[model samples]
Target: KTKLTEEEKNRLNFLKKISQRYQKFALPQYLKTVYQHQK
Candidate 1:
């Protein structure tokens, strides 16, 4: 598994919180685009 710095971990946690807040609605298009690029 990849390792994360403390700062990275904190940032990821913040992102998770924000993601959950909006998950009930349609996801932002930027996230969809990022996933598509990853695929």
Candidate 2:
């Protein structure tokens, strides 16, 4: 099994917080589509 270093854990935790915030304030459908294409 792989282990996450402290820095990786912190980054994931911060990103989780941002993901929650973004869910509350979602992007528009067009933007989402553009982002999906970019991905």
Candidate 3:
């Protein structure tokens, strides 16, 4: 139950679109690793 700001939602949606375009090469592990590192 997380609340996201409109800007954040928009950015996520944009990223989703980009991800779909590169689905064959998408790697959730990389995203998780980067996010964990940033955190």
Q: If both were scored by TM-score, which would come out higher, candidate 1 or candidate 3?
A: 1
Estimate, for each residue in 1-39, the C-alpha lDDT of model 1 and write its tens digit. 356676798999888987777774667776788788976
Global CA lDDT computed for model 3: 0.77
Q: What is the lDDT of residue 30 in candidate 3?
A: 72
Clashing pairs in 1: none
Highest lDDT: give the candidate number: 2
Q: Between the candidate structures 2 and 3, which one is better when assessed by lDDT? A: 2
The candidate 2 region of ten consecutive residues with least summed lDDT is 1-10
TM-score of each: 0.43, 0.48, 0.41
| Model 3 Cα lDDT, one tens digit per residue, 1-39 | 356686788899788988787764776677778788976
* lDDT (10s digit) by residue, model 2, range 2-38: 5668678889988999988886688767587887897
lDDT of each: 0.77, 0.80, 0.77
Q: TM-score of the candidate numbered 3? A: 0.41
Give the lowest summed-lDDT range of ten residues in model 3. Answer: 21-30
Clashes of 2: 0
